[PDB]
Design a binder for this molecule. Structure first.
Ligand code: T7Y
Ligand code: T7Y
Lengths: 304, 304
């Protein structure tokens, strides 16, 4: 029993983290096969970040200017190219610890683990969600850029995130491993504000299932609702519209608990309208939206 | 910026996890040097657990009855002994991935990372605290026993916890790596209830410092208090008495923020008396008590 905000084991990703230095900028790179991936802003001074022309800035950089260090051993850079907002540094040595991997571009509402690194060294691991506004709520200091987000399916790491920047509101923006930003964000130090942080309705419902499975049941009520009725209440509280797709995704948790998805929607409706009344659900005083239905099934069944 | 419930990177511990089978019971073992550590209840049937005599049960077990598997390779057991509530299985092969390690017995209020495993395979990593009632609030299914809790100081893993049992109230009890239970708990399936889950005052104050450092400041007020005055309010709300030792431990965070510990105590007092009023602090709707002052400094400074 018990339900915890749970990251993937970080070992496979720890083995891929390197230090990248260009001039006075040190951040992290991801070493897979003979390629090190890092944010292209490694080449920028903080002054550059105001209005950088990356193609022009990059012309002044040679292979020997990219200092790549795996623990205490230097890697030889034999090539470099810019792909969107990442640099791919070709090194002469394949990472012997390269796990099976994919690059995946995730959807908002999807969760992933971040291995926070500084100077190519792991500091910690925490679970995130791609927010509906395409930000993440991370923990990232200067030097943490190039830290990656990932999922693991058995032995295959799916990298979905590289950390690039902090918005003045303390939320985080980054790219997939092809270097495309999630959402409208740019690697420039400019006026970028996040849109509405809407709550991931399908994840809250998943987490309400996890609560019932783990003994927290006080919020179950005698009511049901319809998608359309629920969605009126969703709109009012800046929750994502619930779709039949979301209902279908919750089917296994419905089946396991014997609570119809729409009945759980009616519970969530009363919770939105009436609050917690100073009660908690799985040790939380608000509705948690960074567990996917897949996360709930994984944790509740003990997948490794 | 940003502050997250953050586990240690699990790689060093992943390298130590093995499967232990005795008869029909499979759980996890910790392989350090040529010793595998696992809960002594590996030798019990669920029927045994009602009133087990471990010395007597153990007499019927030989080295060849302890099936120890690291990934897909079997380890030869050349010795076995019981130390308190753990078994030490001597194997003929030193774990080549043994990190630098210590066994430490932690105090209540101290935090640690758990690597949840099933069948010697990592499922996930989350941060815990030894509760003042000597329980932890974990995520543990059948097969997760022998999962360990740890801290890392640079390159040295300090193992503090092995998971042994779930109380009927869904909270968790276990041992240090010498096999001594935290608190009054026994590896018997019996009437064991947890005492009062008191809140770790010093950790809440640490976390209020982390909030101020990361921009969440609405709860700062014009008031101060005394240890004795604060402790009246602590008593009422089942918070640990705040000691001068706790005040001294918060000194660095006080210095960094310029908020006197007793002024932060006065903030915490108003929060206890008046609630959050539907506001959040570092994305939480309750007062978080599973960050130590050390955790806050580590995360806020980017220690690796
Ligand atoms: C994105 C990131 O991590 N930025 C970064 C890397 C290295 C150094 C910095 N600094 C140091 C102080 C000024 C600054 O931006 C930032
Ligand atoms: C402590 C722990 O993990 N217990 C454990 C290990 C292996 C198998 C079990 N089971 C399976 C179903 C009944 C039972 O107790 C428990």
């Amino acid at each position: 029993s018990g339900f915890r905000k749970m990251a993937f084991p970080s070992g496979k990703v720890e083995g891929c983290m390197v230090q990248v230095t260009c001039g006075t900028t040190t951040l992290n790179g991801l070493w897979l096969d003979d390629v090190v991936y890092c944010p292209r802003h490694v080449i920028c001074t903080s002054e550059d970040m105001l209005n950088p022309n990356y193609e022009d800035l990059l012309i002044r950089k040679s292979n020997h200017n990219f200092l790549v260090q795996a623990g205490n051993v230097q890697l030889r850079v034999i090539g470099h190219s810019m792909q969107n907002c990442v640099l791919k540094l070709k090194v002469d040595t394949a990472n012997p610890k390269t796990p099976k991997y994919k690059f995946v571009r995730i959807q908002p509402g999807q969760t992933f683990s971040v291995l926070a690194c500084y100077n190519g060294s792991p500091s910690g691991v925490y679970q995130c969600a791609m927010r509906p506004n395409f930000t993440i709520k991370g923990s990232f200091l200067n030097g943490s850029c190039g830290s990656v987000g990932f999922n693991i399916d058995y032995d295959c790491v799916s990298f979905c995130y590289m950390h690039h920047m902090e918005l003045p509101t303390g939320v985080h923006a980054g790219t997939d491993l092809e270097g495309n930003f999630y959402g409208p964000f740019v690697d420039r130090q400019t006026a970028q504000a996040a849109g509405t942080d809407t709550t991931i309705t399908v994840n809250v419902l998943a987490w309400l299932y996890a609560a019932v499975i783990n003994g927290d049941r006080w919020f179950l009520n005698r009511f049901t609702t319809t998608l359309n009725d629920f969605n009126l209440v969703a709109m009012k509280y800046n929750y994502e519209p619930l779709t039949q797709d979301h209902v279908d995704i919750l089917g296994p948790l419905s089946a396991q608990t014997g609570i119809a998805v729409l009945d759980m929607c009616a519970s969530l409706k009363e919770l939105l309208q009436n609050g917690m009344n100073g009660r908690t659900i799985l040790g939380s005083a608000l509705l948690e939206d960074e567990f996917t239905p897949f996360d709930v099934v994984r944790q509740c069944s003990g997948v490794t």
